[PDB]
Amino acid sequence: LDPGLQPGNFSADEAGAQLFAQSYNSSAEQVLFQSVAASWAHDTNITAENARRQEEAALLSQEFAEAWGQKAKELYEPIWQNFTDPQLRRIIGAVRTLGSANLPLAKRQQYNALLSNMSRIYSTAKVCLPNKTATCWSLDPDLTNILASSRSYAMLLFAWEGWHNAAGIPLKPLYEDFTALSNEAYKQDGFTDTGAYWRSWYNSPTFEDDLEHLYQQLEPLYLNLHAFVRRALHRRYGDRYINLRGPIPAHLLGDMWAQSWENIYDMVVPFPDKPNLDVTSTMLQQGWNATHMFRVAEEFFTSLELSPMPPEFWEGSMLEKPADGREVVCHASAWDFYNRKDFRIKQCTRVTMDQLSTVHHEMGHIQYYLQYKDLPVSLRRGANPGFHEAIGDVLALSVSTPEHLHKIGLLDRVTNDTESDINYLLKMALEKIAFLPFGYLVDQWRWGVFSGRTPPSRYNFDWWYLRTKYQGICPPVTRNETHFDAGAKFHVPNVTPYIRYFVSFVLQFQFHEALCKEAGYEGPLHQCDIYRSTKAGAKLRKVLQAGSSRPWQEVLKDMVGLDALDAQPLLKYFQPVTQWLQEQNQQNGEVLGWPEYQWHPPLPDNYPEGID
Ligand SMILES: *[C@@H]1O[C@H](CO)[C@@H](O[C@@H]2O[C@H](CO)[C@@H](O)[C@H](O)[C@H]2NC(C)=O)[C@H](O)[C@H]1NC(C)=O
Ligand SMILES: *[C@@H]1O[C@H](CO)[C@@H](O[C@@H]2O[C@H](CO)[C@@H](O)[C@H](O)[C@H]2NC(C)=O)[C@H](O)[C@H]1NC(C)=O
Ligand SMILES: *[C@@H]1O[C@H](CO)[C@@H](O)[C@H](O)[C@H]1NC(C)=O
Ligand SMILES: *[C@@H]1O[C@H](CO)[C@@H](O)[C@H](O)[C@H]1NC(C)=O
Ligand SMILES: *[C@@H]1O[C@H](CO)[C@@H](O)[C@H](O)[C@H]1NC(C)=O
Ligand SMILES: [Cl-]
Ligand SMILES: [Zn+2]
């Protein structure tokens, strides 16, 4: 649109390109700021006006992106990839990829419409009770808490089913259309489908195989945490609802998607009657503010000689579900406005331990932003999406330790023994191990939708194939191809790639090891706490300050000593409980896995009318 943001004109030289990029950066910062700020208004407030606006701002960006896009390749496309300066050719290579901008005007508009709509359908969805046409439940908070702490099978079933129908069914038709378009766009950028484009970010001709191999190494870990919990669950709901030889029913693991079981710790905790490793109740006791949480998280960050939250962040962030009745996308996220000034976090935070680490997780994104803000805009990325999701989790590892919790107030004791040690490790196992299958599975499903191996005619049938197959969980009520359970997961509607969370969970420990070593810690990897270690923090920040300038595979070597992802440091972390669980299941005759696939639990007695 605006002429001042249009390209200009340059030499089909590498010296021309150095200039081309220098320019793009100054202009792009504007066009990106606007589009980002527009969204920030829509997410922090969902109105038809803001959506319209957003959809507009997107059109400009798509406009901008095309101009420099087709220009950068107008004359820099038979030669880049042979440029001396790696950073330069990695920038030009980021610009030559138009993305959605390659789509005719009508189609961009359809595109942008789908996006703001799906995210709207996803965050507006509600679950209403049968007869009481009285006030509905919302994914956050109502639904989450019910899955996090309600032990009523029927009740959980009502919310699990409620949410999955409510969010999925309407989303399906739009998803199929978004996919057709998304592909069409990147098809022109040279990739087969968006799937291939998404994986090209790791630069590894071997990515998928490295991941499949990496999973086998860990599968045994999951299968054991699984049979152990499946047993604990049988113990509580009985023999009618839990099959000791079948997949677990998806709504009993204490989380809507069964992606992390840390909320059922009190039902599987091996050695109970000991100090409780869930500050979640001491946080309330002390009167923890939602802000108080973003301060403790910050404090850790500062001690490692890393920068604190800027004032803009404190003035412009939304750290609580507002009260003006405004409707917001409650999912926690971190925002980079590409203006080296504005960095904020959007999260309907309330006072919970699992929420205290999500705060750290998010700060990790902000800290990554603050660190690389001084690089060409097109390089303000993590080494790879994985590194980004890792950053806050790493520091989280040190925070979760019982020794650290005490140092800061919520673990009233200190019981240095095995039993407590096992409990801790199991708790962490419920959070990190239980997730591995899911994290893998999601983009497994998607790469196949984008490629056509999973047409809308098999959206749900291929989703539960993957879910049963990897998580060993099954749907509590029957399902069919009018359903779209994959769509009930925030990340599918809001088009976010997922294979990054897997990478993240595996290489967050490589970091944890590497950092604990420079901190000068010795003792066990799972009891390490890099707190106040300016030496450790300096090691981390070198990776941060690199953005997408250098290949992750190099930025990783410098920091960890390895050319790639490794589960070894992860196995070393959970070692004790790894052997413990394994020994426990055997004695108790458990069966690792689900041989009775195809098994489904029956409905509550009169469905669906009871104490919800
Ligand atoms: C990309 O362009 C932005 C915008 O000019 C650059 O950021 C500025 O940095 C200078 C100092 O180097 C400050 O005086 C400005 O206030 C910053 N923003 C503005 C408004 O210009 C950034 O350095 C450029 N990146 C590269 C590598 O060229
Ligand atoms: C998919 O399975 C669901 C669950 O059984 C089906 O929905 C029920 O079907 C009856 C009629 O057979 C309706 O009265 C209900 O309203 C439906 N849902 C509920 C809340 O029970 C659905 O028909 C199935 N879809 C297909 C095409 O087989
Ligand atoms: C919510 O969005 C509306 C219109 O998009 C806007 O007028 C209002 O200011 C926003 N809510 C606020 C500010 O509390
Ligand atoms: C998105 O929602 C708006 C508002 O109802 C509607 O006008 C538009 O057609 C929707 N887009 C799609 C493709 O669903
Ligand atoms: C309490 O929460 C409010 C609302 O976010 C915030 O303004 C205030 O700084 C918080 N106080 C503390 C000490 O956390
Ligand atoms: Cl990714
Ligand atoms: Zn994240």
Side-chain angles (χ1 to χ4, degrees), residues 288-304 306-314 316-323 325-402 404-406 408-411 417-512:
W288 277 44
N289 231 59
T291 300
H292 193 342
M293 281 168 63
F294 286 76
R295 270 192 7 121
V296 191
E298 176 184 46
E299 199 229 347
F300 188 102
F301 275 85
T302 56
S303 72
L304 312 191
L306 284 176
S307 47
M309 290 306 106
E312 296 83 307
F313 165 86
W314 286 105
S317 286
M318 188 197 75
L319 321 180
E320 286 172 296
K321 196 186 176 189
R326 331 214 315 280
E327 196 131 41
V328 303
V329 188
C330 269
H331 207 62
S333 54
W335 304 59
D336 186 24
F337 285 76
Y338 294 73
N339 76 338
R340 290 153 295 98
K341 211 212 131 180
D342 265 48
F343 313 94
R344 333 184 206 175
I345 284 183
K346 178 206 91 235
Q347 174 193 315
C348 309
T349 299
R350 240 285 277 221
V351 177
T352 293
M353 195 183 106
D354 8 310
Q355 272 256 272
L356 171 57
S357 55
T358 285
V359 170
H360 286 74
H361 169 78
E362 295 307 328
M363 280 231 173
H365 286 302
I366 302 314
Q367 185 74 206
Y368 210 155
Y369 298 143
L370 305 171
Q371 295 303 326
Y372 59 15
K373 70 181 172 62
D374 293 306
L375 301 160
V377 69
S378 50
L379 299 178
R380 304 183 191 178
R381 279 347 231 153
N384 66 43
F387 286 58
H388 232 300
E389 304 307 325
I391 306 315
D393 276 51
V394 175
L395 288 71
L397 284 174
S398 304
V399 189
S400 305
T401 70
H404 188 81
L405 295 186
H406 183 299
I408 118 249
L410 12 124
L411 237 198
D417 50 284
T418 50
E419 280 190 18
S420 293
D421 193 41
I422 285 288
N423 283 300
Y424 171 59
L425 275 189
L426 174 80
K427 206 196 172 300
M428 293 290 285
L430 289 183
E431 177 172 325
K432 311 291 185 189
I433 304 300
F435 184 85
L436 299 189
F438 190 66
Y440 188 68
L441 150 174
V442 169
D443 265 32
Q444 283 299 304
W445 174 77
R446 249 194 299 207
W447 294 335
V449 169
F450 278 138
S451 86
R453 153 236 241 156
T454 298
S457 72
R458 300 187 216 110
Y459 273 15
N460 225 51
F461 162 91
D462 272 353
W463 171 254
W464 286 94
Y465 166 76
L466 297 183
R467 299 264 298 184
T468 288
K469 175 174 163 164
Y470 291 88
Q471 284 182 288
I473 59 167
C474 63
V477 291
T478 311
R479 327 289 298 144
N480 33 48
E481 283 308 347
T482 135
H483 292 112
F484 185 47
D485 303 306
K489 175 60 191 168
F490 164 102
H491 286 271
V492 174
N494 298 238
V495 183
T496 269
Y498 215 80
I499 194 55
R500 2 163 109 186
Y501 294 113
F502 185 73
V503 176
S504 176
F505 273 52
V506 158
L507 103 153
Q508 79 187 216
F509 294 88
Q510 296 206 207
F511 282 16
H512 187 46

Side-chain angles (χ1 to χ4, degrees), residues 55 109-111 113-118 120-121 174 177:
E55 299 198 50
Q109 292 172 307
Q110 292 168 29
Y111 192 69
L114 293 167
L115 286 172
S116 51
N117 277 7
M118 296 197 285
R120 194 246 305 153
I121 292 179
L174 307 195
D177 281 344

Side-chain angles (χ1 to χ4, degrees), residues 41-42 44-51 53 322 325-327:
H42 174 275
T44 67
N45 189 10
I46 318 191
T47 75
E49 178 59 49
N50 300 310
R53 289 171 183 282
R326 331 214 315 280
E327 196 131 41

Side-chain angles (χ1 to χ4, degrees), residues 530-534 536-541 543-603:
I530 62 176
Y531 186 59
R532 289 201 169 296
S533 166
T534 70
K539 204 206 179 27
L540 204 211
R541 131 168 33 91
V543 337
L544 294 189
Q545 301 220 147
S548 177
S549 89
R550 247 143 84 58
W552 64 265
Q553 350 214 55
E554 267 171 37
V555 195
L556 183 51
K557 193 163 203 163
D558 281 53
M559 177 210 206
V560 173
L562 242 181
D563 241 69
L565 277 166
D566 195 58
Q568 267 190 166
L570 160 41
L571 303 177
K572 160 199 288 263
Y573 183 95
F574 295 98
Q575 213 137 50
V577 75
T578 283
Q579 240 63 56
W580 182 86
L581 281 172
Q582 226 181 140
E583 174 79 330
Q584 284 293 297
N585 294 319
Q586 207 271 320
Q587 344 207 86
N588 284 264
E590 287 321 315
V591 176
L592 302 182
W594 28 113
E596 281 192 15
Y597 68 82
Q598 177 171 181
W599 172 81
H600 288 77
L603 297 161

Side-chain angles (χ1 to χ4, degrees), residues 147 153-154 156-157 160-161 164 222 226 229-234 237-239 241-259 261 264 464 467-468 471-477 594 596 599-604:
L147 277 102
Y153 186 90
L156 302 162
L157 177 57
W160 190 88
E161 188 184 12
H164 282 71
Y222 180 63
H226 183 300
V229 172
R230 183 177 63 197
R231 155 71 89 165
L233 280 182
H234 178 272
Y237 301 110
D239 210 62
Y241 297 141
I242 296 287
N243 178 325
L244 292 173
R245 257 124 104 244
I248 306 169
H251 63 299
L252 308 171
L253 282 321
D255 168 288
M256 189 53 82
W257 307 285
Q259 58 174 57
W261 319 349
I264 55 175
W464 286 94
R467 299 264 298 184
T468 288
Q471 284 182 288
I473 59 167
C474 63
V477 291
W594 28 113
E596 281 192 15
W599 172 81
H600 288 77
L603 297 161

